Symmetry: C3
Subunit: 295 residues, 3 copies
């Protein structure tokens, strides 16, 4: 895109604030940002806030979101679709023009680990170019296993294709499949979907801990066979809804846009790979590491 040549918009922090017991303001950008998706490979991503996947959003069950999108893209319209919410797509997930802002309000009444993404046609193009993310809605009554959890992280799986190539997006295999982590607490890593960062800078944990991962596979196109090497999931909640409770899974199948909360124990010191078990995708980037130490 001629108006994107040379564009590299610095990442802008997510802006959130609570404005009532059940009401939260969120402000995001749509912006054009170079991201190194594999060593030596820059993708001029279409993004929320200069991250791909975008920044993590966390709300409480029952919160109404008053969402603003500020479109920094000089030429392409963008929009926002939160899978968490009940909304009229043709009124509430509509386009914001270049250099404009739009505000939309809708309720998050369901707990879970939801995808968000740009909803502008062609949606495949906007997703594939980077405009995806996760919103977590915390359940009012928690999860039954909350008390057993020692540590938690968020992981997101995505694919990358040939740059802005719709033929490839629709017909081709992914060039890369990747994990990213988005921070829940200070100190947590916050990374973009790339083939290497979570190998070089593993997630951390201690021996004996029960680890919770909030996970979502945002696609655009593939399903995920999510697995932690050297463990078994003690408990899984599909889509992060507490009622959708499975036990003792080795591998959790996630549809495109599918989420889960998974929990597992790391019993020994060492480094534990985290994969999609579709190993063509793992080979093409989708392996993260978890480094478990006596500390």
């Amino acid at each position: 895109i001629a108006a994107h040549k040379g564009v590299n918009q610095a990442p802008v922090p997510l802006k959130m604030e609570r404005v009532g017991p059940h009401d939260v303001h969120i402000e995001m950008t749509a912006q054009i940002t170079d991201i190194e998706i594999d060593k030596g490979k820059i993708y001029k991503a279409w993004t929320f806030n200069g991250q791909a996947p975008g920044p993590l959003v966390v709300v409480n069950e029952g919160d109404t979101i008053h969402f603003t999108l500020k479109n920094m893209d000089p030429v392409v319209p963008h929009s926002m679709d939160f899978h968490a919410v009940h909304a009229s797509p043709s009124k509430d997930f509509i386009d914001v023009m270049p250099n404009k802002s739009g505000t939309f309000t809708y309720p998050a009444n369901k707990p879970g680990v939801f995808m968000y993404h740009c909803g502008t046609k062609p949606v495949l193009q906007h997703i594939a170019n980077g405009m995806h993310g996760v919103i977590i809605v915390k359940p009012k009554n928690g999860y039954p296993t909350d008390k057993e959890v020692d540590r938690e992280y968020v992981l997101i799986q995505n694919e990358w294709y040939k740059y802005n190539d719709m033929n490839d997006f629709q017909n081709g295999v992914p060039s890369y499949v990747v994990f990213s982590s988005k921070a829940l607490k200070p100190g947590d890593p916050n990374t973009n979907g790339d083939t290497f960062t979570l190998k070089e800078k593993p997630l951390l944990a201690k021996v004996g801990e029960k680890i919770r991962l909030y996970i979502n596979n945002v696609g655009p196109n593939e399903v995920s066979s999510f697995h932690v090497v050297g463990t078994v999931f003690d408990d899984v909640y599909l889509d992060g809804n507490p009622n959708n409770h499975l036990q003792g899974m080795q591998t959790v199948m996630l549809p495109a846009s599918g989420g889960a909360v998974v929990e597992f124990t790391v019993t020994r010191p060492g480094t534990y790979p985290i994969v999609t078990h579709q190993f063509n995708h793992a080979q093409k980037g989708a392996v993260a590491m978890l480094k478990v130490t006596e500390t």
Copy 2:
């Protein structure tokens, strides 16, 4: 196929009648019918009754089906496999020759949303060319959420490939992925698997309604990540069996041949896309619309 050149057999209505408290007659055709699968694109489909997917069948749990296939195809044998039933495949899902009929009887003792299809080798060829459909078996005791449902429709996802091309069927990506709707009550739409009809003529509903969809992904080859934009599934029953109850799903993964009953609330007026969230497939046709109005 030389004997299919110029063949375009007019659609024939499904014939059903109840013949006892637990016994139902069904008569279908196998026939060769031109269907416009995308604008300007005619596929000379292999079909049940001149529809692809075929006509909807609905029975009650515990019904024995006395099924007749009348094969109108001038040269290819065809057969019928109902996933609802318990049957001997090598006696009961056998071939009917051109210009002949066959009658087979078997019981539907399980509730749910089942695929049916032609079972003639190579099965991939017969499925891919159009010979798939849905049979709904209504549970004797209903679903626990029946009383909350305001309106219902049936949707079916399928793919289309390069015409009668086995190499493509086995090795290629789909050319189109599509939704169709099949009528449960008078007035409901009844459409074929195409890229456009359910965009141009959305399904209808009113503001505030809880909508039930009976869905099946008949393939032949892909899995589906079924999602309604602007809502969350309140309740999902996998395969339509009442016991397989999930809550609060954003997206339901369906295997090839997989079914579900899903229920969701539309809270605001507007048009709500219905997709598979594998967006390469959505781009290639698999988006239907639901138009929600104050009436």
Copy 3:
């Protein structure tokens, strides 16, 4: 691989023995063995024990496994990852050099139907070349439906690609997708993943029986839509964990590495195909048969 030219190591039996109430020794080989994967097609597989998938392992919930791998491969290192166990991957699933042995100990505390495989980088290469299998962990308290089961077998789904071709492994469609069966009791068949053996020599059962299948789809890359023609699954336990209980499924979606215990009744004499319902994969080999007789 130059050092694999002309290598065809005769299959070696799995060695197992119990050494305490909760402790079991297992000894396997890594070895290079020609397997006929389709008629006329030899694949010089990388294997455990000269089988691909490898030999079946069955332990009890709560058993600690003291596992030895004897690497017979003249030039490539190999390793073992059991999805059943809790282990440190970087200490316990490490490489064994050519012509060496390694011993690793870890506990199987979760019931189910778990994949095992070689864990040597690149893992895709080692899996794709044949180094996969199943370990069954029997639940201490059984399954609630145990008393209804008349007969049982183990099936495994895998793919085969172009020989040792990483480009194909990562980017190409499978050349074959296959089922194998691994023996639970004397007399049961024990076969390799090929396109034909379970067609020519169907699994056997009697009319009226309830059949349990322990199934795993080891991939490397595809998901499976597992279905038995002419029946419906009465009961399904995802990953073989008794708590993950579904009823009345027509088709069970399995992720890559995903397992299940499925149970179904065969009501009439005849031959019942067993498929993945992704029919491109079925066409490419993944159909087994079950022959049901009055005896």
